[PDB]
Amino acid sequence: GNKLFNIAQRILDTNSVLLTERGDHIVWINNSWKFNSEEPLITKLILSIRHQLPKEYSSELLCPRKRKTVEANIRDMLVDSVETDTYPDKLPFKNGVLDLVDGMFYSGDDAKKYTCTVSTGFKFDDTKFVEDSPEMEELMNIINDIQPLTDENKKNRELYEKTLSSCLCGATKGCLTFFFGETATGKSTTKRLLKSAIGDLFVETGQTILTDVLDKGPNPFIANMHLKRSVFCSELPDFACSGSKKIRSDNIKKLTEPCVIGRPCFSNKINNRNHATIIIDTNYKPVFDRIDNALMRRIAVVRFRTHFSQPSGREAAENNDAYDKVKLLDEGLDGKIQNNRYRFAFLYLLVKWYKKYHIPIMKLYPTPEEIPDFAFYLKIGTLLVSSSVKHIPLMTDLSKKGYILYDNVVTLPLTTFQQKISKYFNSRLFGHDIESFINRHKKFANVSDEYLQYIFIEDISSP
Amino acid sequence: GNKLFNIAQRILDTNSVLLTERGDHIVWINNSWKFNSEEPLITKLILSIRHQLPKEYSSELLCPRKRKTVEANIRDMLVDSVETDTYPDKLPFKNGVLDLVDGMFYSGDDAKKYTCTVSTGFKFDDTKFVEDSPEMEELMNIINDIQPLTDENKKNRELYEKTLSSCLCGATKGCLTFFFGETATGKSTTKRLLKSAIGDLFVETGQTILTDVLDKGPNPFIANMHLKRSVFCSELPDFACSGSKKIRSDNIKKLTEPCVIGRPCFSNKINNRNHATIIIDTNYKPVFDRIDNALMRRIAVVRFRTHFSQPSGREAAENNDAYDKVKLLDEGLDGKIQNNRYRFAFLYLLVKWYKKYHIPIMKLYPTPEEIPDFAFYLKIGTLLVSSSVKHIPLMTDLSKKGYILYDNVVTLPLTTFQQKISKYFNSRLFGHDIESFINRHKKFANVSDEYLQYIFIEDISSP
Amino acid sequence: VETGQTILTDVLDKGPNPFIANMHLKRSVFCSELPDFACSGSKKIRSDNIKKLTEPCVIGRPCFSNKINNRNHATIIIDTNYKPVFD
DNA sequence: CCCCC
Ligand SMILES: Nc1ncnc2c1ncn2[C@@H]1O[C@H](COP(=O)(O)OP(=O)(O)OP(=O)(O)O)[C@@H](O)[C@H]1O
Ligand SMILES: Nc1ncnc2c1ncn2[C@@H]1O[C@H](COP(=O)(O)OP(=O)(O)OP(=O)(O)O)[C@@H](O)[C@H]1O
Ligand SMILES: [Mg+2]
């Protein structure tokens, strides 16, 4: 009995509705997996696949009440969760899945085995996914204008290519990249090109994810990054002028983890999967509230140094020290990019870069030598080291150099340490930094009298 | 079988219901696309469209329960999403779409192709959309009073026309405009005229979008500009009297982007499409917290200099240097404008100006010479040149002026550079600006020594 | 489970305390990158909070919840690099 | 329930 129960069982036997570990209901319609808590996806699937059931079952599914009964039966039948979005080298489209390691495009049940629950939102066109075209030469000219193929720009260009290509691989990336440069240098053009290329896998959020508390309450600004392969933030302010909050290192470290806590309004799903490449456009370098060794492992910088100016302001730009090259501005390029002219050309370029930079494992490495905020830590980290045991047979040398021994621990006088620091970094130049380092790296032998359990590398080098 | 399903399929075959990429269901009623998130209009469409169905189908749609069944069927039928508001040269009305490029007015299925989800809110009158009328003469008299057709006011008048006409096109603009003048000069009259002309494509917000962070929590002030073609802000709080917040350059840069990040109350949507010309009525010049070249790329100024006064204060007005002309105030003009007397005359004028200023691509250009804040930067840009390869083969002569060579680069001492700068600008004028420039462009070979790699134009010119 | 330095350098109860609530049937709690006390101008870990953690039911509630009586079967492991200072 | 507070 229960024709409706039989219909629900038949639909469940097709493996077209699945329950995820988070609590979602993903359905397979029109050659793609979709989930949406606001749309009647299960009844949509029932109506869509009414054609694959017997003729006596097809006519029963034209009634919304009966479709809702079938949906209730299916919901009670789904008891086990599944693992979704586990292939980091598959790019999902609206009509199939592209193999990023092989170049094969799968449609239908071939693409169904990879439970890719997101998509670009548009259809793959193999007649445009071609190497040579009128659009490809123009796109290559644009890219070579933005990032010149010169010898002094080799490393920066390769880093730019790697960062752009990493927006295809759906895994957790462990760095935050900063597109730094002066005005009119191509950063927004690059952003728009990437958005056109990867479609719905691209999202843009606010600086609140960098300068606010992520726990909070309902946070759609974080909940909108679930499974996105690229996240953009833009327009960092100048932190030198007091009045702007600094970037939270806690947020920076929390954004590189495989899961991020944040939930929408009227929703109970708090944890989102992190597959994102986070890129920040800025005219100014970042300043963080607190600097430590971990934070320095998650920051990378790509610099833009080509100006596109109108003919009136070309001469003033040619004498600027923030530009290496000046080019003529193009006034139709924005519209051409907006109309998705270079979508498949840039997609092909990104796939080629993915192949080139995906030597067995692809990983993003930090560039801490570019951020001025990290210079004080980087310099002093190679000059002073903790107490020494194998250098214990040098206590006479330490005493002659000014150090003292206390429980076989090297201690330096505060005044002597200040005088030594003044040589490498002037007091007038970095008094706040030197005083903070003295107060932070030193232990308190008393309320007033204290000592630093850190000796200079050069002092120990002296025999 | 299933008359209701047949009705639903027939209605779906007319493409009168669409599902948008933001999750809305837009319906085609009364020659326009409409949607309401809090109260869907699909049943309204069913009732309205019942007249185009067979006679045996029209009678079933008089029952709300049957209409709801048909709506459920349609909702299950709608699977794919569509893109809306993609034509910038179409002006939507409540009964059709006006082709700005061509001049033809489309109604019916001709206006259906352009999925414009916004409208002016009033119907287009072809009889009032005429060049020869009693209203047009008065309107041109008013406009020539506000912005005279002299030779001194020619560029200002052209900028005025361009900014006013740019409120008809649905595309992202690159500049923010300031309507600057003294009191009783026609700025609010211009705002009211434009509001009367374009109806619901016009919005007015607060200064929070200029002086406050946009992401934060729910911000209806920034979320209400979605797809608006004109945004007005008024009455900047003069910043000389300390106690008023300054304008955020980060906000200025963010308001120019094609997408603005901000959400309403009880909404998960965090992106808004920027189609708006943003204008601010001011008695005072803007003051920004940080001034850089990226800010000086997005500011334009139109100045109003005609005074409309009561007969009593005419002489005290004529002895004022802020006015180039004094006329007689009209007391019925406010009511005449509020009664939509010049709506179609001003609309015709705006379309004519659109055609005039839409040489193939129309673009808003900055006017950085009208802001006194930018003067120091503009002068410094001309009074200095960055040392280059050509500067190297000049050291033997540059030593006469005190210039030195270090690291194969021509540089000058900090004290000498400070004295040279003081020789051009006094301390009391821009001491803070000079100090900020020195801090932001200083090259410190040692921690105690600082220098600038810039040369004065006079020394380079002299041989 | 792993939590930041909020549980140590802030109020354990406060308002919403997800960090405190995450120890609910969590046999191990980890803390990383502790704020060494040599710097002047930082908050302090509370001996009262230590005693509260030693109590057989530590104060802690989830968001929009009143079931603050969450049983404690947790041993906290705190990882740092500098000697702590207790007032 | 969010927002508000
Ligand atoms: N290769 C190119 N050749 C010619 N014109 C270009 C090229 N790339 C970009 N342009 C144009 O020159 C200008 C460059 O500004 P763009 O918005 O790309 O960068 P930006 O000012 O650094 O960005 P942001 O919005 O982050 O400040 C734009 O008007 C763009 O259309
Ligand atoms: N061409 C004109 N001829 C006669 N009267 C005019 C004309 N244009 C405007 N007026 C009237 O003169 C007055 C000027 O006020 P208006 O609102 O235009 O000034 P405003 O520049 O916005 O002033 P404020 O800066 O104080 O807001 C109004 O009463 C307006 O109706
Ligand atoms: Mg006014």
PDB file of C-alpha atoms in Angstrom, chain A residues 338-445:
ATOM      1  CA  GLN A 338      31.608  43.884 -17.535  1.00  0.00           C
ATOM      2  CA  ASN A 339      30.048  42.208 -20.592  1.00  0.00           C
ATOM      3  CA  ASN A 340      31.994  38.962 -19.908  1.00  0.00           C
ATOM      4  CA  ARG A 341      34.169  39.281 -23.012  1.00  0.00           C
ATOM      5  CA  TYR A 342      37.275  37.610 -21.519  1.00  0.00           C
ATOM      6  CA  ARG A 343      35.478  35.048 -19.339  1.00  0.00           C
ATOM      7  CA  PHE A 344      36.598  31.839 -21.054  1.00  0.00           C
ATOM      8  CA  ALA A 345      39.931  33.303 -22.194  1.00  0.00           C
ATOM      9  CA  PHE A 346      40.840  34.197 -18.613  1.00  0.00           C
ATOM     10  CA  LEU A 347      39.514  30.812 -17.473  1.00  0.00           C
ATOM     11  CA  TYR A 348      41.876  29.058 -19.900  1.00  0.00           C
ATOM     12  CA  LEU A 349      44.760  31.250 -18.731  1.00  0.00           C
ATOM     13  CA  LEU A 350      43.965  30.420 -15.097  1.00  0.00           C
ATOM     14  CA  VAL A 351      43.841  26.685 -15.848  1.00  0.00           C
ATOM     15  CA  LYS A 352      47.214  26.852 -17.608  1.00  0.00           C
ATOM     16  CA  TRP A 353      48.696  28.711 -14.630  1.00  0.00           C
ATOM     17  CA  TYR A 354      47.173  26.083 -12.322  1.00  0.00           C
ATOM     18  CA  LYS A 355      48.952  23.351 -14.274  1.00  0.00           C
ATOM     19  CA  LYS A 356      52.226  25.298 -14.263  1.00  0.00           C
ATOM     20  CA  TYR A 357      52.223  26.113 -10.530  1.00  0.00           C
ATOM     21  CA  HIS A 358      50.729  22.814  -9.311  1.00  0.00           C
ATOM     22  CA  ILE A 359      54.021  20.947  -9.084  1.00  0.00           C
ATOM     23  CA  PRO A 360      53.054  18.044  -6.840  1.00  0.00           C
ATOM     24  CA  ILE A 361      51.697  20.274  -4.042  1.00  0.00           C
ATOM     25  CA  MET A 362      50.664  23.923  -4.384  1.00  0.00           C
ATOM     26  CA  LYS A 363      51.222  26.077  -1.298  1.00  0.00           C
ATOM     27  CA  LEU A 364      51.251  29.835  -0.723  1.00  0.00           C
ATOM     28  CA  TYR A 365      54.263  31.177   1.148  1.00  0.00           C
ATOM     29  CA  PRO A 366      54.359  34.405   3.185  1.00  0.00           C
ATOM     30  CA  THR A 367      56.497  37.419   2.281  1.00  0.00           C
ATOM     31  CA  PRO A 368      57.217  39.077   5.647  1.00  0.00           C
ATOM     32  CA  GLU A 369      60.012  41.290   4.271  1.00  0.00           C
ATOM     33  CA  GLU A 370      57.493  43.581   2.535  1.00  0.00           C
ATOM     34  CA  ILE A 371      55.395  44.691   5.532  1.00  0.00           C
ATOM     35  CA  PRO A 372      56.999  47.621   7.407  1.00  0.00           C
ATOM     36  CA  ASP A 373      55.206  46.565  10.602  1.00  0.00           C
ATOM     37  CA  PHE A 374      57.250  43.344  10.708  1.00  0.00           C
ATOM     38  CA  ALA A 375      60.681  44.942  10.209  1.00  0.00           C
ATOM     39  CA  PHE A 376      61.438  45.466  13.906  1.00  0.00           C
ATOM     40  CA  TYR A 377      60.610  41.852  14.757  1.00  0.00           C
ATOM     41  CA  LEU A 378      62.493  40.490  11.736  1.00  0.00           C
ATOM     42  CA  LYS A 379      65.665  42.456  12.498  1.00  0.00           C
ATOM     43  CA  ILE A 380      65.782  41.773  16.242  1.00  0.00           C
ATOM     44  CA  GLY A 381      64.896  38.106  15.717  1.00  0.00           C
ATOM     45  CA  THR A 382      68.261  37.500  14.027  1.00  0.00           C
ATOM     46  CA  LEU A 383      70.280  39.426  16.646  1.00  0.00           C
ATOM     47  CA  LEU A 384      69.145  38.274  20.111  1.00  0.00           C
ATOM     48  CA  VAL A 385      68.597  34.674  21.221  1.00  0.00           C
ATOM     49  CA  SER A 386      67.579  33.002  24.477  1.00  0.00           C
ATOM     50  CA  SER A 387      70.016  31.825  27.159  1.00  0.00           C
ATOM     51  CA  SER A 388      72.891  29.575  26.098  1.00  0.00           C
ATOM     52  CA  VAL A 389      74.074  26.302  27.654  1.00  0.00           C
ATOM     53  CA  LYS A 390      76.815  25.155  25.276  1.00  0.00           C
ATOM     54  CA  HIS A 391      78.190  28.711  25.511  1.00  0.00           C
ATOM     55  CA  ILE A 392      78.402  28.423  29.314  1.00  0.00           C
ATOM     56  CA  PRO A 393      82.228  28.176  29.090  1.00  0.00           C
ATOM     57  CA  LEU A 394      82.266  31.857  28.133  1.00  0.00           C
ATOM     58  CA  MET A 395      81.066  33.493  31.375  1.00  0.00           C
ATOM     59  CA  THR A 396      84.321  35.457  31.604  1.00  0.00           C
ATOM     60  CA  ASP A 397      83.674  36.825  28.108  1.00  0.00           C
ATOM     61  CA  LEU A 398      80.099  37.666  29.112  1.00  0.00           C
ATOM     62  CA  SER A 399      81.322  39.523  32.210  1.00  0.00           C
ATOM     63  CA  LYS A 400      83.879  41.421  30.120  1.00  0.00           C
ATOM     64  CA  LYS A 401      81.108  42.318  27.648  1.00  0.00           C
ATOM     65  CA  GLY A 402      78.780  43.399  30.476  1.00  0.00           C
ATOM     66  CA  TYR A 403      76.585  40.330  30.954  1.00  0.00           C
ATOM     67  CA  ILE A 404      75.982  38.700  34.340  1.00  0.00           C
ATOM     68  CA  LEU A 405      75.283  35.142  35.497  1.00  0.00           C
ATOM     69  CA  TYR A 406      72.342  34.260  37.758  1.00  0.00           C
ATOM     70  CA  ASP A 407      71.444  30.581  38.241  1.00  0.00           C
ATOM     71  CA  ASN A 408      73.437  29.865  35.059  1.00  0.00           C
ATOM     72  CA  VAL A 409      71.222  32.298  33.122  1.00  0.00           C
ATOM     73  CA  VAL A 410      72.674  35.179  31.110  1.00  0.00           C
ATOM     74  CA  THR A 411      71.293  38.567  32.160  1.00  0.00           C
ATOM     75  CA  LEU A 412      71.976  41.969  30.641  1.00  0.00           C
ATOM     76  CA  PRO A 413      71.766  45.306  32.481  1.00  0.00           C
ATOM     77  CA  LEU A 414      68.879  47.473  31.310  1.00  0.00           C
ATOM     78  CA  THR A 415      71.042  50.545  30.673  1.00  0.00           C
ATOM     79  CA  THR A 416      73.642  48.504  28.782  1.00  0.00           C
ATOM     80  CA  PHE A 417      70.886  46.890  26.704  1.00  0.00           C
ATOM     81  CA  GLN A 418      69.434  50.309  25.866  1.00  0.00           C
ATOM     82  CA  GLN A 419      72.879  51.581  24.852  1.00  0.00           C
ATOM     83  CA  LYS A 420      73.456  48.500  22.682  1.00  0.00           C
ATOM     84  CA  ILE A 421      70.041  48.882  21.030  1.00  0.00           C
ATOM     85  CA  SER A 422      70.757  52.561  20.328  1.00  0.00           C
ATOM     86  CA  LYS A 423      73.625  51.547  18.020  1.00  0.00           C
ATOM     87  CA  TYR A 424      71.541  49.422  15.639  1.00  0.00           C
ATOM     88  CA  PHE A 425      68.332  51.472  16.003  1.00  0.00           C
ATOM     89  CA  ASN A 426      68.505  55.095  17.118  1.00  0.00           C
ATOM     90  CA  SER A 427      66.606  56.127  20.230  1.00  0.00           C
ATOM     91  CA  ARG A 428      65.027  59.090  18.435  1.00  0.00           C
ATOM     92  CA  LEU A 429      64.027  56.794  15.563  1.00  0.00           C
ATOM     93  CA  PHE A 430      62.501  53.866  17.476  1.00  0.00           C
ATOM     94  CA  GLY A 431      62.233  54.745  21.162  1.00  0.00           C
ATOM     95  CA  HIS A 432      58.752  53.267  21.513  1.00  0.00           C
ATOM     96  CA  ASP A 433      59.767  50.029  19.783  1.00  0.00           C
ATOM     97  CA  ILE A 434      63.005  49.676  21.768  1.00  0.00           C
ATOM     98  CA  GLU A 435      61.288  50.373  25.097  1.00  0.00           C
ATOM     99  CA  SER A 436      58.477  47.936  24.283  1.00  0.00           C
ATOM    100  CA  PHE A 437      61.006  45.247  23.344  1.00  0.00           C
ATOM    101  CA  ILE A 438      62.972  45.860  26.552  1.00  0.00           C
ATOM    102  CA  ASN A 439      59.817  45.649  28.673  1.00  0.00           C
ATOM    103  CA  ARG A 440      58.474  42.593  26.796  1.00  0.00           C
ATOM    104  CA  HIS A 441      61.500  40.325  26.275  1.00  0.00           C
ATOM    105  CA  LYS A 442      62.783  40.778  29.852  1.00  0.00           C
ATOM    106  CA  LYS A 443      61.641  39.025  33.013  1.00  0.00           C
ATOM    107  CA  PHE A 444      61.086  40.907  36.271  1.00  0.00           C
ATOM    108  CA  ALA A 445      63.646  39.990  38.915  1.00  0.00           C
TER     109      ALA A 445
END
